[PDB]
Amino acid sequence: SQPDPKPDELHKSSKFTGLMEYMKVLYDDNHVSAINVKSIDQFLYFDLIYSIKDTKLGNYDNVRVEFKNKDLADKYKDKYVDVFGANYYYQCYFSSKRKTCMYGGVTEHNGNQLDKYRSITVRVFEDGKNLLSFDVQTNKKKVTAQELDYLTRHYLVKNKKLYEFNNSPYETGYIKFIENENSFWYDMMPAPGDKFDQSKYLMMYNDNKMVDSKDVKIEVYLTTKK
């Protein structure tokens, strides 16, 4: 479905002159996750607020989930859901600090649990060559592209240094999800300039896009500085 990246469409890391650490930390070990929870408040018409405690680090007591539109919020407001997302803290504030914020990441709980974890294959290309493949796992029937993207990049940061403090080894990168007839992709590099706005980058997950875990596969295309 989505047309592939055009020549010069993808962001180049060489044109980003801020600190890549601000991208890296979105795909380090920490993220929001909750199972079988229901929203307890709402700030604006396109969001839902969840009482999810940060049991790991103790940084927050509530999470605001922002969607692309009212219809998405209306759909999830009184449902028991699972939540999985890359969250941000900078100027995260809402009426309902001790807060964190994310986009989308929401799937209904009931009917969506698998009996066993499913593996999803990622094939990594560097300058067009498949030098590495690995799996990520989920136990959700329908899983958000967000969750899979986070799992994929988390592995690549650990093992291939996809993002570092002040660099990437890669000039461009995109992650492509292929679910039979449906394919779409995200640019993995920050926009040009000397600042990286985490909230604005994450907003791309606000459509709550999801895929069938049984049928999806993942391709990551990176180019080197060669």
The residues near 5 (Cβ < 8 Å, ≥ 6 apart) are 174, 185, 187
Number of folded domains that form the chain: 2
Q: Which pair of structure tokens corresponds to residue 214?
A: 């049984």
Method: X-ray
Task: With H, G, I as helix, E, B as strand and everything else as coil, classify residue 21.
Answer: helix
The residues near 220 (Cβ < 8 Å, ≥ 6 apart) are 122, 123, 124, 125, 152, 156, 173, 174, 175, 176, 188
9, 64: one domain: no
Task: State the Cα–Cα distance between residues 111 and 61, nearest whole angstrom.
Answer: 28
214, 195: one domain: yes
Domain that holds residue 102: 31-109
Indicate the helix (H) or strand (E) that contains 18. none
Resolution limit in angstroms? 1.9
164, 92: one domain: no
Task: State the Cα–Cα distance between residues 56 and 8, nearest whole angstrom.
Answer: 41
Q: Which pair of structure tokens corresponds to residue 124?
A: 């990594």
186, 210: one domain: yes
Task: With H, G, I as helix, E, B as strand and everything else as coil, classify residue 208.
Answer: coil
Matching residue, tokens 């999830």: 76
User: Is residue 163 domain-resident?
Assistant: yes
